Design a protein around this ligand. Structure first.
Ligand SMILES: Nc1ncnc2c1ncn2[C@@H]1O[C@H](COP(=O)(O)OP(=O)(O)O)[C@@H](O)[C@H]1O
Ligand SMILES: [Mg+2]
Length: 329
């Protein structure tokens, strides 16, 4: 489908433990229900999505949506679409602390790797097992943060902050001077991910709290070169894969300019995705949607995973997230 939407509820976090929070989220099949802690006698509000992932307990539970399960449902098919020659995009949306980064990047031990590392590993595994000498590939990667209309290159510590998105008169949007590195193995792209993830949480990022107030975009340019025994000509097939970890949705203590930009960005993205779902568009209303325009076109495939806190104390924000995800359909 043109657009796929999933929601995922995580285990209680420290804040919720400290408040003795009750779980107000329940899931069954494709449906997620949310209880209003102040109106517990009511029938919970219900929402249906392509996927409703119950990740509130732990991998020890038979009924726990693992990193692997999430990837195999959404990531795997997006990768397949990329191999067919089309652009794809996966967005993680939701309140700060809901589980966006965990879902997209995840962790290392007990292999809690998220969508991005799993997709990258899958990509290279498929490439290396290629047993057709007429097929060769190239994998180029860019990793950046979009904060208040400015782009930060997470793969270049020296540059720092500042880049601007521009519109080439004929070739579309691009970030001037943004690093685009060729990678020939999973280990190498994993080194880049690690380095970039490190950059997102260094001490200085706490000044403007960019780990939660900026949009992190991991881009892969996948080129497939097909050789012809006869004619000896090579036809190319380029696919653009954009894996995005959005700024916290509650921020849409917040600076007026920060909030304005995050609100505008998340709001425009919602309009874009809803339009794409309707066909199966004001891209320049925000830098995020402008830069990703070609990944959000009629030919592209997009998916969103909306992270949810399970706690009573976040009812309002969680309901807002469910409604946002619902509209994206
Ligand atoms: N499904 C999950 N299972 C286990 N831990 C999770 C899950 N989702 C999120 N977490 C944990 O919750 C915390 C917050 O998630 P995180 O991705 O950092 O939030 P966000 O990126 O939306 O601000 C992290 O400390 C992370 O380890
Ligand atoms: Mg995060």
């Amino acid at each position: 489908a043109s657009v796929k939407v999933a929601v995922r509820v995580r285990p209680f976090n420290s804040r919720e433990m400290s408040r003795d929070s009750k779980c107000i989220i329940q899931m069954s099949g494709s449906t997620t229900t949310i209880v209003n802690p102040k109106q517990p006698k009511e029938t919970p509000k219900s929402f249906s999505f392509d996927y409703s992932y119950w990740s509130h307990t732990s991998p020890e539970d038979i009924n726990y949506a693992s990193q692997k399960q999430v990837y195999r449902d959404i990531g795997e098919e997006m990768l397949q679409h990329a191999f067919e020659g089309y652009n794809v995009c996966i967005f993680a949306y939701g309140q700060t602390g809901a589980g966006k980064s965990y879902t997209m990047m995840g962790k290392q031990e007990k292999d809690q790797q998220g969508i991005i590392p799993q997709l990258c590993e899958d990509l290279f595994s498929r490439i290396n097992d290629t047993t057709n000498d007429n097929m060769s590939y190239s994998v180029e990667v860019s990793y950046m943060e979009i904060y208040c209309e400015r782009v930060r290159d997470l793969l270049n510590p020296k540059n720092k902050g500042n880049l601007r998105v521009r519109e080439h008169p004929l070739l579309g949007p691009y970030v001037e001077d943004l690093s685009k590195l060729a990678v020939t193995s999973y280990n190498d792209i994993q080194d880049l991910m690690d380095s970039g993830n490190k950059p997102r949480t260094v001490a200085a990022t706490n000044m403007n709290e960019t780990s939660s107030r900026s949009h992190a975009v991991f881009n892969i340019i996948f080129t497939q070169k097909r050789h012809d025994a006869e004619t000896n000509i090579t036809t190319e097939k380029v696919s653009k894969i954009s894996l995005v970890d959005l700024a916290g949705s509650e921020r849409a203590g917040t600076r007026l300019k920060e909030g304005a930009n995050i609100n505008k960005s998340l709001t425009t993205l919602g309009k874009v995705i809803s339009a794409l779902a309707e066909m199966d568009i004001p891209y320049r209303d925000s830098v995020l949607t402008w830069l990703l325009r070609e990944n959000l076109g009629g030919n592209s495939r997009t998916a969103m995973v909306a992270a949810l806190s399970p706690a009573d104390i976040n009812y309002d924000e969680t309901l807002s997230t469910l409604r946002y995800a619902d509209r994206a359909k």
